[PDB]
Amino acid sequence: RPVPFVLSFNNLTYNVTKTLLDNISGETRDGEILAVLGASGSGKSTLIDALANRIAKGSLKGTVTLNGEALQSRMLKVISAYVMQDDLLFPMLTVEETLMFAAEFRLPRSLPKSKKKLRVQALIDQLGIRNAAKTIIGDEGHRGISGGERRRVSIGIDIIHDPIVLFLDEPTSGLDSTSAFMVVKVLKRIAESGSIIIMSIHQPSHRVLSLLDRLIFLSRGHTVFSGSPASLPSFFAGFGNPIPENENQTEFALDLIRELEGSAGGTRGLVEFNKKWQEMKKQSLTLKEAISASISRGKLVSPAFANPFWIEIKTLTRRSILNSRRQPELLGMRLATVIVTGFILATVFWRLDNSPKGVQERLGFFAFAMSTMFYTCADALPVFLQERYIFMRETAYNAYRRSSYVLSHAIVTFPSLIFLSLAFAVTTFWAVGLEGGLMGFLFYCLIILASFWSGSSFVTFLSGVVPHVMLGYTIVVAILAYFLLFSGFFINRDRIPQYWIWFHYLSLVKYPYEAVLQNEFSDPTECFVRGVQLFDNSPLGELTYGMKLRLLDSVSRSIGMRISSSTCLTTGADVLKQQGVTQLSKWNCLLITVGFGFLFRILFYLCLLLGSKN
Amino acid sequence: RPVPFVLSFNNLTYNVTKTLLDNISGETRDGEILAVLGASGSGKSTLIDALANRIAKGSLKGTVTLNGEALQSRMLKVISAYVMQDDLLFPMLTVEETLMFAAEFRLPRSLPKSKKKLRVQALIDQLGIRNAAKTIIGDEGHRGISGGERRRVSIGIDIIHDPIVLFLDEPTSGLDSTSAFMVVKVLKRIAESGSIIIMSIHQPSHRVLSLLDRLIFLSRGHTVFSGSPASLPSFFAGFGNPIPENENQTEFALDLIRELEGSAGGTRGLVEFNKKWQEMKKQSLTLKEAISASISRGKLVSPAFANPFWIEIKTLTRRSILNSRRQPELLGMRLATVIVTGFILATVFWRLDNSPKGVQERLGFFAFAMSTMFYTCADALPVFLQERYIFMRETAYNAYRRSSYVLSHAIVTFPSLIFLSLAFAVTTFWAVGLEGGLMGFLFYCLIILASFWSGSSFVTFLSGVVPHVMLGYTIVVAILAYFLLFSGFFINRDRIPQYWIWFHYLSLVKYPYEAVLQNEFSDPTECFVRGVQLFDNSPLGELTYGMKLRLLDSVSRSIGMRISSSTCLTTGADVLKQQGVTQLSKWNCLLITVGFGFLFRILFYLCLLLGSKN
């Protein structure tokens, strides 16, 4: 015996004015399924949105009462669930630990973990997915479970607290009819446990129509039929056109409503015929304690969040580790890109000399190397966009905080950024022949790591403002190119016009590039022009060694400074003065690179606030 | 009265061994539709591929005879058509001129154009698309015709010669059942004109099943049912499980075959039951002149190609012009990208002086400008991939040559490349302050045009080897970056190691970059170092004007050459010697850029040869 529940909704009118819903009425009990149909663009997605209070409230007029009293929004977040229309699952998780991660986010922390696992096992048996309980979910290619068992996993995630009311936006969409029958046979099994099912459906078959107990047909937001499937031949016989034998009901009726959308009559005669057809059928408790009676029967397993701030971080981190450990070809293809790019740069710029052309080749190596770190952070854009679509599904249920999501996402990607930074520094420090020994190599690893951190924080921020991968990849490639034009390599800082100098200081390439230059040209003992090398790239100075030695001391008669054959005119400190790299220290350039990464994680948080209302 | 035709096929076995088809048999007449069903992966796409001789011939064993004799491949290219499974249409064309372009490619040139237009008008009435005859076809967003009328346009393109046999791979795929009924009602109308229809179908309804006259159900390449729809209750009653009332036939039968794919029995009992069920129904001309009789009735309207080589170019060019004239926001968004990139570069590099830092800023302007021309050619990759999918549909019918496609594609894109080249040269020649006057500006326009020509030829070639836009866009961005590293700007040609110099000469950026450098530093009257400017970037030379004047003549005592206060040491010819730009002339650098574009149009032709067998 389940506790009886009755959901009644009357006079639902929704204006946006476009009047998308007009005088909808209905009634649903437990043990039954109310199916809503009618067209594409008919308003059935808007009808179950209005029944679930997921609207811009203040535009809906009408009463929605459960068991007699009312439905405010704070009761409907405890006893209801809304399964949205698609599957958005992590592919490398088995369906037992997919449902177990949902239990840790939503069921209370007062419940022991042994009883949480018992709820998952009882839900695996109630759904039709006992046969594949340790198979991974899979994707395009990893060979997991089928499309009809993925649908019962995404349904079973949303019913983890075992609600009393269950809203479903087209739960059989995209399935073949032998797996679209097992979905509705599971939804009939949930209804027999004491639940109220309200679902949208496109084209029900003859098999799933025996399981639906009530039907509502809509025609641009007007109800044109309301009743059992075994009243549909009796309904349209009174309208003037009965249903033939060996024809699918709710299919000829669905075609007749689309046929009656012409220009002479319209469906207004059918809206008026329905609202007096219901008038021929007129003849024929204790909601706060009825809910509490059902918790004693064993239904409602389940503060705004079930866990504190630190439990949600360690659960989100463990899920992201377990999902990327079982895909060890995403990190392997990122290691292989960085090593090949570093191997090419190390063999082109192999062992640069202390020539004036080797100084300009050092600046070109560093400008190209810093720009590859920011570009190779853009291949995380498809996986950064898979989540934030799963995240937007789970924050409708208050599964975890918005702070715990951004913090655990910044934590799990940081071990991969250390391996990428160490792989690029090992391939390029000793082969290009950079300066510093061991302390210069360690600063080289730190600023490569700070560039991977700020470049992935920038792509994380872009993955919250773009809809698809191609738009966000175009924006990365375009803005990185202008970060390189304004980095001080193509045109120096003291030569950039003053109406463009605001974008020089906003360049994400400028600060790591100015840090590796000051790490490189830091020794006072390095020398790039000695003695007779004053006359190399001038027309004066195509002469012999003995001829330029009297060219040197003939300059010493004028000034008084004696320039020997080895005087060390141009050092590394003079290279940085020629390029204009003088304003910030190399440790202050490292801190602006780390600080730019933190700013793009904060702007990513602020776009997840606005992305919930959008 | 139509001429009678009979298509009979027996003992079709196809091994690849995986035996994808095993002992298929059937018979089809005119006026009737043979529908093939059974599963996903069942082999129904392979069955109509074998009936249309579109296989690797030599692996099929079995006889396929039309009207008694045989079917070799040269008769089946005159009297048959194969409609493939999707719509691939140009969106800006009305459906009258979409069918009129198909008539000019396939109907013979002996036919007058007045009779070609009469064939299009008679086909518009036979299809269900008289109501939208001048509506454009449309796409994702341009609001053309509906999805069910797009299907009858793509069907009507393939029946433009009015064949006798019509193969159809799932012609109702992706349609709602009120538009999937009008497709089969049109296919029944074509059959009544004297045609043989053989189609695949997923999930027929109760309405389209009345139009199909024969059914063949397959179960991994074995026939399990063969007969009329009004023999399906009688068939499965003898198997042990009849069909219930108010259940869709060919749906319960389709589910039972999927149910009988278990592990104990299998469908082998049903394959054996079918091949003796057909044995209980055993009791109950002049093909070369039967075809010629039907041409007299008015069916077959239609050399390997219907038009000469030059008529196909002027028809393909007119179609590409008419399709892009009605989309004047693809060229407008390409003008807007080039002008904004040119405006940014002209205000950063505004009016460069004849300083040693203005020389290095000229090299960075030219390296950045030449790299934007090759990048902005990559936004033609989605439209270059829409065609070559339409082209691969139309070369199954020999609509036009492979030479006419590549030549007219290189012709229609060239007026847009002239406007892009003139827009970049106008924004940047006078603002950066480049040298040459008018003859230097005209060479500047020519090498920007040669860079747009070779960069779009490179993207045209990539659009014949990549499947999707995201892979080809990743390859462009990666290879352009290494074309810039090896262009001589980051490291000069005489400093590149000899194991990498093969890729320097293959760089697409090197030759236009070396042409604008030699156009710029060509005047013998330009000067970048004069007199006392010998001591600018050295520690010698932080002195006054009078102090360096005795530094000048003190060098003249040694050599004998007198260096005045104005001697013009470094000219533009010395800048090119310092960069190593000495091997090729600027006209020979322009010709290698034009010649690289022609090579990538030839490699694009050679990938359309291999792309037909692939």
Ligand SMILES: CC/C=C\C[C@H]1C(=O)CC[C@@H]1CC(=O)O
């Ligand atoms: C060093 C970058 C080379 C060329 C610059 C171009 C890109 O690489 C991507 C964007 C830029 C053109 C644009 O979009 O304005």
Ligand SMILES: CC/C=C\C[C@H]1C(=O)CC[C@@H]1CC(=O)O
């Ligand atoms: C001047 C180009 C700047 C950085 C180079 C990176 C790109 O811009 C695209 C590819 C390259 C990294 C790679 O893919 O190896």
